[PDB]
Specification:
Keywords: Respiratory supercomplex, CII2ciii2CIV2, c1 sate, membrane protein
Keywords (chain B): Membrane, Transmembrane, Transmembrane helix
Structural class of chain C: mainly alpha
Oligomer: part of a larger assembly
Entry title: Perkinsus marinus Respiratory supercomplex CII2CIII2CIV2 in c1 sate
Order of helices and strands of chain H: EHHH
Helix content of chain H: 25-40%
Number of helices of chain C: 6
Distance between the termini of chain C: 58 Å
Bound molecules: cardiolipin, 1,2-dioleoyl-sn-glycero-3-phosphoethanolamine, the ligand CCCCCCCCCCCCCCCC(=O)OC[C@H](COP(=O)(O)O)OC(=O)CCCCCCCCCCCCCCC, zinc ion
Strand content of chain C: under 5%
Order of helices and strands of chain C: HEHHHHH
Chain A: Cytochrome c oxidase subunit 30
PDB class: membrane protein
Largest sheet of chain H: none
Helix content of chain C: 40-55%
Chain lengths: 141, 75, 147, 107, 226, 230, 62, 141, 62
């Protein structure tokens, strides 16, 4: 049985409605921008259009598309080095999804997977990526 | 997957409710042929009034085949 | 469909941890959006790219429990587990489970009226109808007389 | 044009043969200039004025409902004399319609 | 509501510099004794501590989960009050239209004071009459002299106070088990390690419990120039 | 729950401004009038500050109220110009056969119409940036250059005109209509000198007001050009 | 809106009443004179007291 | 559009009378209960019955009109909207081009012709013996 | 004049009709915040001004 809850929005001018406790928990969880991350999936049509604005991103996006990776843009800038981990991460997430989905109702045990390759997780909280917004060419050449 | 560039999508329709906005039957969306006929007549009157400056002062002499009571004697 | 599609409030991200858009006057840093799209990739193109929320796999058992307890919520939770939930899918889930606040008339204290007074309600209504009948007839009578 | 509320004959049928039209006086009473006590100070004379408002008066009917002092315009609804701040809570103009929604009811 | 202006940035979240620096006392303060800012950060710290602990969520009941996030389980008393509050707010900049009032179901006129000016326009169509204004004072069942429409005043009053979302939450919500600071530390180490902070609120909160300036980079975070 | 309006209970600028106005009348020196004008500017600016500080009330109807006031004001500006056009055309039957030199239809009208059009384009770019939450520094200085040239050209024209106000009602109407336009041009300088980027963006009545006013003044010059030069 | 001008506030109690040293209630200026003359007539007028009520307004010679 | 209109061009608050068309009717629909079937007599009025937030559709409209103010990306409008937004700006720019490349050339030609022949090329040469350029707008003579 | 919002209002086609008037009546209105309320207020105005027989006499005079 799921109880109803009051959900309020606004700081000084507050609007109260009734809502689902689980839906509110998901809403706050997705607000943890550092933990839950949006990831991009590409198609060949859109990868080609990217080249019209950033040639380097087109090449890196093509690699992600060829491997069918849902990848964060920040990671995409380092796909050359992160590719082996990303492929391993893809497998582990798929294993976990399958295990949880196939489990019988009422079975809420944690999935068995290698969390060390999945980011962001306690086992691997990620890397300190250096900014790549640095010119490396001499205008006089 | 397949997508559509938002810049070339069609305009969204007005919502269908008790209070519905409809401009289809007004005919005020764009200038019609009648407006362009007004422009053509204006150009014509402008040119005519200058080309033929004796039109407002016509000749009262009239022959009129089939007399004056025939339809082609009124134009 | 409001403000030309520009959100009143939106998230911006910066690659350099010590970057300040107000103190610095450099010309190389490119801001990103909430999904991480660099600013040099136009909106028309980035909005076509499909972005889905990825929660850590340790949350899958919790998202599964939510679906089972509320079967109407299961399809949305399944999308989230499978990494198929976009922002639009989240919005649909959010507004689908919002319910209006309920007011109960049985909880309102009533103005004080004695039991004797409560038994005269039909009589007072009866007087009111006769007053409306007499009013309406008099209107015709007076209109005829004065005009 | 307005000609009063419509009446159905069924609504004009009494429940007793002795029913007549209630003879309740709608004259509020005898009044004059509000008379302040000398002893009362400015604060207590303000309370006195607030307790002499005709628009706060009503007539109670035989069934316990009261017909209030009513006016065509809201000018007669503020305290007399008019206070500095009158309509703090927005006056509510009640409109009536036949529309209804299911959420308001319970079976 | 249509009468409200645009959401502020604060309407979504508060800056971490508004977090009370005495976190240890904040997590021990009763709800009735917490101010608006203190209550915001009590709920956010405790709510995010439970949400950022995935392994414990499936075994946590909705009653306990709602308490941790600071959400009030609804009941008929609180629903009635909240509903009448939102109805009052809506009527601030919206028209007042509804069914014809009768003795069984009087027109409900919400008010904070003991009086509110009301106008009767009669019924629908030909039964509509000119506006008849009257002062609706509490404790009387009003009857329009023209159409016999019954009115009644509803007061949003509770124990020398009017009805507010804060009042409803204080009166009906009950504080649960006292928040344990060990949970804050445990979750802090989970998402914050080796210069990576994936729970910024818990890094600041743990720093304050430690005394302010203890965790790496926090002295530099607290050093401002103006 | 709060009140729908945060009532303003007291104000003292009104007394000062009304006294400042009286000084214009009750004075024995024209220098006093010059300094009095500065006092007026100062206190009108204080009233504008009160308007900006009213933003703290977060009242949705405030933008609408001010916007419609501007509409009424623009209407009054249009109707004042109409009265001058009326004065001009009433004596039309006494024009064009008097021994005076009316203005050419080639030089002044063209350079002025070209100039004022560029002013509109700048304001339009400012509006476009306002829509896009962006700013371009050079824009305001282009306005200053345009105003400088306009002032330079109008001054020379008046000084080199060989007919005076007392020569004919035609000349009086020409000078007066041109001056009335110039005054409205100068009022545009008064408004535009404060243009800056404000982060509350499209809830700022200043931006819409400037766009409307500049368009009014340019459109008014089209009417003047047809009446007098062409 | 939290912390905005309240829609309703209760009046604070009036200031303490003042008595004279002998206990006589202190009286304050009152512009309601009792004119001195021999006339004692009382005129009453039915007056509009809204839409459905009236009031019997009396004018007294004094 | 430039001018603010509460009903259509409401950019000050962003209020919209109806929800987005993208939302399923089961998720959100316009507030319209005019077609509600007659209430059974045995049903009893619990709520106020007053038009307001007790109705689900109105509540969701208020909620969405506040929670729509924060969005991850822009809702790109179509080119028709973009053209309308700056219709006056573009038209004025083309007017400037016309004044430079159309009005400019023939006005110059007329003055040069006037220099040699005393009157503009679109005027009737006089024989009265009066001197000067004379009228310029010949159709207003 | 219908009293139920379910019953539609007849409109001719053109530049001065019931549909043309509905589109523009609420452009500057802060009170027409939703379909139900907007239609109620629209029909209220139409009933009051366009279904008033004597109002048409002034239309002739203008
Ligand atoms: C407010 C000033 C008004 C001046 C009006 C003058 C009218 C006459 C013609 C002037 C032609 C130049 C352009 C004027 C239009 C405005 C330009 C503009 O928007 O600039 C923005 C530009 C950057 O603006 P921003 O806000 O930072 O960026 C806006 C955009 O986002 C980014 O902008 P962008 O990068 O897209 O640029 C837009 C582009 C658009 O403009 C064009 O492309 C127009 C091209 C026109 C060609 C005409 C032929 O403009 C430019 O590229 C402008 C380049 C200016 C470089 C100035 C460098 C310093 C010069 C110092 C000279 C010192 C001389 C000393 C002599 C001493 C002798 C003893 O502003 C400046 O750089 C400031 C200067 C603006 C131009 C001033 C022109 C003065 C001309 C003086 C001539 C004196 C001759 C003396 C001869 C003596 C002989 C003996
Ligand atoms: C160390 C130095 C420190 C200087 C500190 C600032 C001093 C300001 C005072 C000053 O110089 O006054 C004399 C200065 C120059 O006048 P002035 O012609 O040498 O002496 C007046 C003559 O007695 C009589 O000449 P007027 O009858 O031709 O009158 C000229 C006009 C003097 O003022 C003006 O002419 C106004 C100047 C701005 C003109 C803007 C015209 C804009 C276009 C309007 C329409 C076309 C106008 C065509 C002319 O008189 C009053 O406005 O103007 C003033 O009296 C005040 C100027 C400042 C305001
Ligand atoms: C002789 C000298 C004449 C001088 C003319 C000066 C014009 C200055 C303003 C020019 C300007 O910026 O206009 C563009 C701009 C275009 O507006 P937009 O929203 O971008 O238009 C979008 C589309 O055009 C499509 O727009 P839409 O058709 O969807 O409708 C939106 C727009 C449509 O309107 C406009 O756009 C107006 C355009 C005017 C152009 C004039 C040339 O609505 C408004 O802007 C309404 C403004 C308020 C009008 C208030 C009228 C008050 C007087 C009513 C009569 C009272 C007395 C009755 C007596 C008889 C009783 C029986 O106009 C305005 O925003 C200005 C509105 C206020 C003008 C007030 C003028 C005095 C009255
Ligand atoms: C096989 C097909 C080939 C077709 C070829 C078509 C060729 C058409 C050529 C058109 C040339 C038009 C030239 C106009 C020159 C005007 C110069 C001029 O007047 O300059 C000054 C004047 C301002 O003078 P003020 O002293 O201020 O006096 C007036 C105001 N008081 O300046 C202006 O008007 C500025 C604008 C100049 C516009 C010049 C236009 C040139 C157009 C060339 C078109 C070429 C088309 C070629 C088509 C090829 C197809 C195969
Ligand atoms: C395509 C654009 C067309 C614009 C048309 C605008 C029409 C506006 C008309 C408004 C006023 C109409 C009044 C009726 C016409 C009468 C015209 C007339 O008789 O003009 C001359 C007569 C004066 O002559 P007398 O007094 O007999 O002797 C003078 C001796 N020195 O009347 C006038 O003075 C006309 C004054 C009105 C002209 C200006 C009207 C308003 C202009 C608005 C501009 C925007
Ligand atoms: C002239 C008086 C006009 C009064 C009606 C219009 C007032 C108006 O819109 O002013 C405000 C508007 C913008 O303020 P916001 O904070 O966006 O809006 C106020 C709160 N919403 O202010 C301005 O227009 C700026 C004025 C700056 C120049 C003032 C120059 C005064 C010159 C006086 C000469 C004598
Ligand atoms: C205050 C002053 C204002 C300015 C001056 C006002 C002048 C009067 C009002 C004019 C307003 C016009 C606005 C534009 C409307 C428009 O274009 O309106 C356009 C409409 C057509 O509408 P569509 O665009 O829908 O087709 O034009 C017509 O209805 C006419 C069609 C063409 C007819 C051609 C033949 C005409 C013959 C006329 C003979 C006249 C003989 C007279 C003998 C005495
Ligand atoms: C506010 C309410 C207003 C209601 C409407 C009032 C309209 C009043 C019109 C009255 C016209 C009477 C004079 C007619 C001309 C005349 O006798 O005029 C007499 C002259 C000369 O006649 P004779 O030479 O034969 O003696 O007629 C003509 O030369 C031709 C006249 C043509 C008229 C056409 C234009 C008017 C059309 C009117 C239609 C509507 C009429 C409504 C009547 C109630
Ligand atoms: Zn009534």
């Amino acid at each position: 049985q799921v109880p109803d809850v009051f959900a309020t929005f606004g700081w000084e001018r507050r609007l109260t409605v009734i809502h689902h406790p689980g839906v509110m928990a998901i809403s706050k969880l997705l607000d943890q921008r550092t933990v839950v991350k949006p990831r991009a999936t590409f198609n060949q049509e859109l990868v080609e259009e990217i080249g019209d604005y950033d040639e380097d991103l087109q090449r890196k996006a093509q690699v992600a598309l060829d491997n069918g990776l849902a990848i964060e843009w920040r990671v995409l800038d380092f796909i050359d080095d992160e590719l082996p981990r990303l492929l391993a991460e893809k497998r582990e997430i798929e294993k976990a999804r399958e295990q949880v989905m196939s489990k019988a109702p009422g079975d809420y045990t944690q999935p068995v997977f290698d969390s060390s390759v999945v980011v962001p997780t306690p086992a691997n909280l990620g890397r300190n990526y250096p900014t790549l917004n640095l010119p490396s060419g001499d205008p006089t050449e | 997957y397949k997508t559509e560039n938002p810049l070339y999508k069609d305009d969204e329709p007005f919502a269908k409710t008790c209070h519905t906005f409809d401009y289809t039957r007004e005919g005020t969306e764009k200038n019609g042929l009648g407006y362009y006929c007004l422009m053509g007549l204006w150009a014509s009157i402008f040119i005519w009034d200058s080309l033929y400056t004796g039109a407002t002062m016509p000749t009262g002499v009239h022959r009129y085949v089939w007399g004056p009571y025939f339809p082609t004697a009124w134009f | 469909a409001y403000n030309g599609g520009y959100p009143f409030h939106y998230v911006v991200q910066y690659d350099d941890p010590n970057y300040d858009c107000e103190a610095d006057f450099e010309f190389e840093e490119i801001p990103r959006d909430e999904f991480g799209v660099p600013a040099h990739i136009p909106p028309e193109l980035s909005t076509q790219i499909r972005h889905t929320y990825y929660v850590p796999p340790q949350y899958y058992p919790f998202l599964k429990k939510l679906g089972e307890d509320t079967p109407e919520l299961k399809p949305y939770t399944d999308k989230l587990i499978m990494g198929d939930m976009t922002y639009d899918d989240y919005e649909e889930m959010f507004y689908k489970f919002a319910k209006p606040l309920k007011i109960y008339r049985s909880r309102l204290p009533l103005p004080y009226r004695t039991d004797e007074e409560i038994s005269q309600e039909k009589y007072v209504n009866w007087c009111g109808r006769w007053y409306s009948y007499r009013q309406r007839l008099q209107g015709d009578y007076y209109s005829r007389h004065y005009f | 044009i307005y000609e009063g509320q419509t009446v159905q004959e069924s609504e004009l049928i009494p429940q007793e043969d002795d029913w007549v039209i209630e003879e309740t006086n709608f004259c509020l009473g005898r009044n004059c200039y509000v008379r302040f006590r000398e002893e009362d100070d400015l604060a207590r004379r303000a309370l006195h004025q607030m307790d002499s408002q005709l628009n706060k008066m009503h007539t109670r009917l035989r069934d316990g409902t009261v017909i209030p002092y009513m006016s065509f315009h809201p000018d007669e609804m503020v305290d007399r004399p008019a206070p500095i701040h009158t309509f703090s809570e927005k006056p509510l103009l009640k409109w009536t319609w036949d529309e209804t929604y299911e959420e308001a009811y319970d079976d | 509501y249509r009468h409200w202006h645009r959401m502020s940035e604060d309407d979504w979240a508060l800056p971490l510099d508004s977090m009370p620096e005495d976190v240890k006392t904040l997590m021990a303060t009763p709800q009735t004794e917490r101010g608006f800012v203190e209550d915001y950060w009590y709920n956010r710290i405790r709510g995010e501590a439970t949400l950022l602990d995935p392994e414990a969520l499936p075994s946590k009941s909705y009653i306990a989960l709602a308490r941790d996030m600071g959400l009030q389980i609804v009941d008929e008393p609180s629903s009635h009050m909240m509903g009448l509050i939102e109805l009052y707010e809506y009527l601030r900049g919206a028209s007042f239209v509804g069914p014809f009032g009768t003795i069984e179901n009087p027109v409900l006129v919400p008010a904070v004071g003991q009086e509110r000016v009301v106008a009767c326009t009669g019924g629908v169509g030909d039964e509509e009459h000119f506006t008849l204004w009257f002062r609706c004072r509490e404790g009387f069942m009003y009857r329009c002299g023209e159409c016999d429409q019954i009115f009644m005043l509803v007061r949003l009053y509770y124990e020398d106070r009017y009805w507010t979302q804060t009042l409803v939450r204080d009166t009906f919500m009950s504080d649960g088990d006292m928040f344990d600071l060990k949970t804050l530390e445990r979750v802090h180490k989970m998402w914050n390690k080796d210069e990576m902070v994936r729970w910024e609120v818990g890094y600041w909160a743990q720093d304050y419990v430690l005394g302010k300036g203890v965790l790496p980079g926090m002295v530099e975070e607290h050093t401002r120039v103006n | 729950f709060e009140l729908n309006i945060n009532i303003i209970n007291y104000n003292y600028l009104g007394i000062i401004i009304t006294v400042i106005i009286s000084i214009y009348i009750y004075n024995n020196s024209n220098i006093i009038s010059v300094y009095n004008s500065n006092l007026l500017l100062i206190n009108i600016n204080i009233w504008m500050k009160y308007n900006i500080l009213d933003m703290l009330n977060l009242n949705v109807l405030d933008y609408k109220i001010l916007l419609w006031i501007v509409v009424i004001i623009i209407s009054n500006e249009i109707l004042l110009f109409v009265s001058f056009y009326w004065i001009y055309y009433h004596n039309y039957i006494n024009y064009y056969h008097v021994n005076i030199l009316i203005l050419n239809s080639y030089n002044i009208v063209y350079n002025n119409i070209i100039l004022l059009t560029l002013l509109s384009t700048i304001v339009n770019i400012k509006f476009y940036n306002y829509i896009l939450s962006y700013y371009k520094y050079i824009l305001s200085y282009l306005i200053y250059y345009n105003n400088y040239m306009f002032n330079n050209k109008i001054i020379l024209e008046y000084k080199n005109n060989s007919n005076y106000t007392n020569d004919s009602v035609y000349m009086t109407s020409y000078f007066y209509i041109i001056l009335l336009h110039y005054i409205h041009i100068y009022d545009s300088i008064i408004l535009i000198v404060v243009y800056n980027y404000v982060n509350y963006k499209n809830i700022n009545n200043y931006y819409i007001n400037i766009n409307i006013y500049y368009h009014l003044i340019e459109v008014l010059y089209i009417v003047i050009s047809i009446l007098l030069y062409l | 809106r939290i912390g905005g001008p309240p829609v309703f506030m209760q009046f604070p109690p009036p200031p303490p009443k003042e008595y004279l040293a002998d206990g006589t209630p202190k009286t304050y200026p009152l512009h309601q004179p009792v004119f001195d003359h021999g006339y004692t007539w009382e005129h009453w007028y039915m007056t509009n007291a809204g839409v459905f009520h009236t009031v019997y307004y009396g004018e007294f010679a004094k | 559009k430039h001018f603010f209109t509460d009903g259509a061009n409401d950019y000050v608050t962003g209020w919209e009378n109806t929800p987005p068309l993208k939302f399923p009717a089961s998720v959100m629909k316009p507030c319209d209960y005019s077609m509600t079937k007659p209430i059974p007599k045995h049903w009893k009025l619990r709520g106020s019955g007053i038009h307001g937030p007790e109705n689900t559709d109105l509540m969701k409209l208020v909620l969405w009109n506040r929670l729509k103010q924060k969005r991850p990306q822009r809702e790109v409008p179509n080119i028709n909207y973009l053209k309308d937004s700056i219709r006056l700006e573009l038209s004025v720019n083309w007017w400037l081009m016309s004044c430079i490349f159309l009005w400019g050339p023939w006005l110059h030609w007329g003055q040069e012709y006037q220099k040699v022949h005393e009157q503009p090329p679109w005027a009737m040469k006089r024989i009265d013996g009066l001197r000067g350029e004379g009228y310029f707008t010949w159709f207003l003579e | 004049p219908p009293t139920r919002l379910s019953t539609p209002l007849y409109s001719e086609g053109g530049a001065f009709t019931v549909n043309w008037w509905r589109n523009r009546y609420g452009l500057y209105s802060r009170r027409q915040t939703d379909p139900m309320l907007a239609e109620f207020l629209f029909r209220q105005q139409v009933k009051e001004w366009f279904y008033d027989v004597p109002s048409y006499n002034y239309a002739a005079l203008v």
